[PDB]
């Protein structure tokens, strides 16, 4: 079961609904596509990668690796993560 997150520049990211419901903001925007007019694709792809990461490593005994973030995208990602509350 999937939802579509669309970046400001038209890229369409298709992720599992439960991965997206991580974000309270997206939960609200759904209650099933969501258009993000401020989030470019090089940020939204990272947001989707985090969903996968959180779902995989939340409550896990297997050692947890650092979630990587390039300096180039950190500001923009911070803005997005703040807005999405994730």
């Amino acid at each position: 079961m999937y939802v579509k997150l669309i970046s400001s520049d038209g890229h369409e990211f298709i992720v599992k609904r439960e991965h997206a419901l991580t974000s309270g903001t997206i939960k609200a925007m759904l209650s099933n596509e969501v258009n993000f007019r401020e989030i470019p694709s090089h940020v939204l792809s990272k947001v989707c990668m985090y969903f996968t990461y959180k779902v995989r490593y939340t409550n896990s005994s297997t050692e947890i690796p650092e979630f990587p973030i390039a300096p180039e995208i950190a500001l923009e990602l911070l803005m997005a993560a703040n807005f999405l509350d994730c």
């Binding site: 890229h11 694709s41 090089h42 990668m49 985090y50 969903f51 996968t52």
Partner: protein, 103 residues
């Protein structure tokens, strides 16, 4: 062992996972469920290489330690419009700006 993927065509990106032991064809079924196109109208690629239906994602080089949740591997996707397959095309993501003077 799970592998984590971005299946990409044009401006479409699918985030999903699969078993290392699962087949290219089985990945196409997943795409079929999501994009409503049968396997015969699909080609999957690793970089420039055309993938064979019967081969496992493991043989094709998608392993659990390279295809990671936080940094998943890309699988190219191309559709057959009617008679012939289109060429593999993946629109790049937008570019981040210059690092501010303070960073």
């Amino acid at each position: 062992m799970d592998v984590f993927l971005m299946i990409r065509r044009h401006k479409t990106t699918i985030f999903t996972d699969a078993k290392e032991s699962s087949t290219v064809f089985e990945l196409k079924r997943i795409v079929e469920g999501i994009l409503k196109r049968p396997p015969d109208e699909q080609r999957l690629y690793k970089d420039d290489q055309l993938l064979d239906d019967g081969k496992t994602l493991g043989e094709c080089g998608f392993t659990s330690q390279t295809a990671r949740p936080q940094a998943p591997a890309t699988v190219g996707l191309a559709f057959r419009a009617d008679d012939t397959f289109e060429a593999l095309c993946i629109e790049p993501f937008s570019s981040p700006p210059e690092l501010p003077d303070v960073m």
